[PDB]
Amino acid sequence: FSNLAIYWGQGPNQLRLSHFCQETSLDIINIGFINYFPDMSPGHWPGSNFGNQCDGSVYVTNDGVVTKLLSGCHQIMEDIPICQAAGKKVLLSIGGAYPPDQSILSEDSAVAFATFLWGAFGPVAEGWEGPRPFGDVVVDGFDFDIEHNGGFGYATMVNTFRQYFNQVPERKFYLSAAPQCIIPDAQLSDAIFNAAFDFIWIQYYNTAACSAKSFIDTSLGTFNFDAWVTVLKASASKDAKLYVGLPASETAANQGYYLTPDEVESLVSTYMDRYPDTFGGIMLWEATASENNQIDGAPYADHMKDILLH
Ligand SMILES: CNC(=N)NC(=O)NC
Ligand SMILES: CNC(=N)NC(=O)NC
Ligand SMILES: [Cl-]
């Protein structure tokens, strides 16, 4: 039975997370982004951006270095557990679109980047002494939305997280990836091939050559979900569920990539029938675009769920 994932955190004038915690149709919420990586950011701490959510306070380290990690995200801290008591999985997303100049420079820093995020946003640990930006919150895992600068270091972060997950056997944690169509994917093919993700949502918008709309109009490009299944079945990610990532309204992505619920039904019905043990559902970019695209009294994502359930 098939799932609906959605991104929240980067919506203009977005409602707070708890508004989406109450939308039953949501299965998984990815929260973006940890958009500053340790190698290029103050103090070698990662940094975060959550739109109108946190107050804008950043941590300053014991050394008095002013970081780019937001320290005043009180609404997110309150909201994540609500979502989790509604049975949703909340994943913390790494990367996104802005800024476009972040990457990982060494395997060492790839290990420290995952260890930092696990200390900061994972279970509360006795020996941890860094920030706890969401306090006692424990996210359900991490999403890799790497959109620039190549694929170095991410397989190592994923493998690192998994080693940590295993030290905590009583709870299942999750790893996911958001690549683009154009494959190999410059940022994430290596991670996908060489590490186990639970979920992979291919972004099927913003690239003309293989978009979801090219499914509807086959002269625009060639929709390539078939090739992606073949790649996945030889990867360390062979047990991943593979989702179709879509814009939740006309303006959530560049012109021409939004599909109407009718087009969505055609695509999804073919791919769910063709790949019943691999197809995972729909990912949506993003929560605020979906909230603002009300069709017959319900947001776009409610309609996506209805499509998936039938
Ligand atoms: C799709 N990624 C984003 N929109 N990212 C940001 O707005 N980061 C500040
Ligand atoms: C412009 N970059 C994006 N829209 N990124 C995402 O949608 N990542 C899920
Ligand atoms: Cl609100």
Question: Residue 61: which CATH number?
Answer: 3.20.20.80
Q: Which residues are catalytic?
A: 147
Experimental method: X-ray
CA of 47 relative to ligand 3 center, distance in Å: 24
User: CB–CB of 118/132 below 8 Å?
Assistant: no
SS3 at position 143: strand
Domain count for the chain, please give it. 1
Residue reference for tokens 């708890």: 18
> CB atoms < 10 A from the CB of 279, how many?
21
Give residue 96 CA to ligand 3 midpoint distance, Å: 23
Q: Give me 283's structure tokens.
A: 């990912």
Substitution candidate for ligand 1 out of 48, 98, 257 with most atoms within 8 A of CB: 98
Cβ–ligand 2 contact at 215 (below 6 Å): no
- Which among 18, 1, 3, 20 is positioned nearest to 291, based on CA atoms? 20
Give the residue numbers spanning the domain of 96: 1-310
Task: Using the mean position of ligand 2's atoms as its centre, give its distance from the Cα of residue 167 in Å.
Answer: 32
Cβ count near 209 (within 10 Å): 14
What is the position in ligand 1's atom list of the atom closest to the CA of 286?
A: 1
Ligand 2 touching residue 103 (CB < 6 A): no
As a whole number of angstroms, the distance between CA 122 and CA 164 comes to: 10
Q: What count of other Cβ atoms lies within 10 Å of the Cβ of residue 136?
A: 9
Q: Are the C-beta atoms of residues 109 and 153 closer than 8 Å to each other?
A: yes
Overall resolution, Å: 2.3
Supply 198's token pair: 């639970």
State if residue 10 touches ligand 1 by the CB under 6 angstroms criterion. Answer: yes
Which phi and psi angles does 126 have, rounded to 5°?
Answer: -55, -50
CA 145 to ligand 2: nearest atom: 8
Helix (H) or strand (E) holding 272: helix 261-274
